[PDB]
């Protein structure tokens, strides 16, 4: 009600696309599979989370596999940290010369965005609005 008339210097609007059910898991302080490698909200997140279904456009008959999520990271997520390193992690003694394999993984895996998905699992376009105040 008061978000219409509250002054914040900046709004961090983060736009992306994920699976349907995972939206409610994006909460201030909530932890999960995304809160450690892709995007974690700060423990003092004062804002909003919006998500709308886009199965009509973001789903292919043969399978829309253009969207990817990152699985591994060299460290745990701190409040509003962006690690986008494409260097393959070395989880053992095997040198990772740009190719896939055990202990040599490119951290990105494709989303299975297809019309077959149910409403709670359809591709949702999600925007997180994090308001900043001094």
């Amino acid at each position, epitope marked *: 009600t008061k978000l219409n008339d509250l002054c914040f210097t900046n709004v961090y609007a983060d736009s992306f696309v994920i699976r349907g*059910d995972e939206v409610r898991q994006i909460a201030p302080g909530q*932890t999960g599979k995304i809160a*450690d490698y892709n995007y974690k909200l700060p423990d003092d997140f004062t804002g909003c989370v919006i998500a709308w279904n886009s199965n009509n456009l973001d789903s292919k008959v043969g399978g829309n596999y253009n969207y990817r999520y990152r699985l591994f990271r060299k460290s*745990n997520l701190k409040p509003f940290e962006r690690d986008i390193s494409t260097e393959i992690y070395q989880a053992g003694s095997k040198p990772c010369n740009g190719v896939e394999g055990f202990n040599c993984y490119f951290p990105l*895996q494709s989303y*299975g965005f297809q019309p077959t998905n149910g409403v*709670g*699992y359809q591709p949702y376009r999600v925007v997180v609005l994090s308001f900043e105040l001094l």
Partner: antibody
Amino acid sequence: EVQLLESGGGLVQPGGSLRLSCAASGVTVTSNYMSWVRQAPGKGLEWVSVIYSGGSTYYADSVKGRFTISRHNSKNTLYLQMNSLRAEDTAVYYCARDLREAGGMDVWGQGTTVTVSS
Amino acid sequence: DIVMTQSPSSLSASVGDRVTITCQASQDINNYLNWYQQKPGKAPKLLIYDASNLETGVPSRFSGSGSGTDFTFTISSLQPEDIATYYCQQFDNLPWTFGQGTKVEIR
């Protein structure tokens, strides 16, 4: 080299606290997901609890407060205490690490049998 | 919330017979389905991932198909090494409710 061993359990009296230890080498406990699973003798799988990376512990509703979890970075090991264990919890316990959406939980650990029978 | 129960609960066949397993969920799951082999006594072992690619060790007789809620698993020739219980579950929404489980035993 990578190796996962377990310790803890026996034939202690009911109401006797115990402490399971999961010693893993070759991985990073701090930045990996892990779970505890108990299995009855001669039965199927039965999940118990989950630990995430960064200090986030959760269980099922029946085991809401079961565990007291701590870690030691000297040997990258987990210690996990239960106060006043329960009678039917006699089972083989496993600490497990799941890779999730890139092939899920291929190889299992050792698993130790704990009997809290009267 | 989401409870995922196997369509087959108890299937018994002989050596070399076809085995058909249906793995359905309450609603659509994607990329969160694995085909395991626990076996009596020994530690559980995952064999088939993503239902499309064969892993090192699994014979080519095993096949998987499906894109969406229902994934189907076919064994053309049952072997004594396949005496086991297949479990496919939803490891997405806690708590993890248990399924029926497809216990395949040879005769």
